[model samples]
Target: DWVIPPISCPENEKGEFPKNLVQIKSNRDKETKVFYSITGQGADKPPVGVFIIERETGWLKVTQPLDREAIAKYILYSHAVSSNGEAVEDPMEIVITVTDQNDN
Candidate 1:
């Protein structure tokens, strides 16, 4: 399992939706052929589309403004794919902390 470090971002970044959360890549031999997907929390269920990824670049981005009170953190399960629809690596987790911007 990949231990991706936790990410902290503004709780309410006005007009900054669709911001790049992080760039995740696999050093696997077939990095070029690797495909990716994310699930759980913001990705799997309601508040859908809050989290998205750039397949080619392996970049994780947030499409909606975050609110700590609304969602303290998210456990987004990510996995990699390759040709023939096979998952080569184990599913990994990305922790996202919606920190307060002190906007109060």
Candidate 2:
């Protein structure tokens, strides 16, 4: 009934801000507008602002470089809801895998 996949990003990718991770959309998107909400890790939990998403477009972005040594991974929960705040899909588990920054 769903097909959301985990996200992986490398550390020290300090090229710029708002680095796009991925784009997602509900199957019912064509018929109705869907909004995205994310929590946990890089979000409400802690290390906030590290990650963000476009509520209407579901474009996940990394605001800054992640530190693999400090935190190897991040657990995020995403939900699809209507503008009125009605759940359209179950909360999906998204894994943020911080790749090694080792150049040694």
The C-alpha TM-scores of every prediction are 0.69, 0.72
lDDT of each: 0.69, 0.74
> After superposition, which runs of candidate 2 have C-alpha atoms over 4 Å from their true positions?
25-33, 83-86, 100-104
Candidate 2 per-residue lDDT over residues 6-102, each given as its tens digit = 6676787756687876676455465567788788877876777678888887887878777777778777887778776667867678877788654
Candidate that would win on lDDT: 2
Model 2 clash pairs?
none
Top model number, TM-score: 2
Model 1: residues with Cα > 4 Å off, grouped in runs: 1-3, 25-33, 83-86, 102-104
Residue 39 CA displacement from its true place in model 1, Å: 1.2
Roughly what TM-score does model 1 have, to 2 decimal places? 0.69
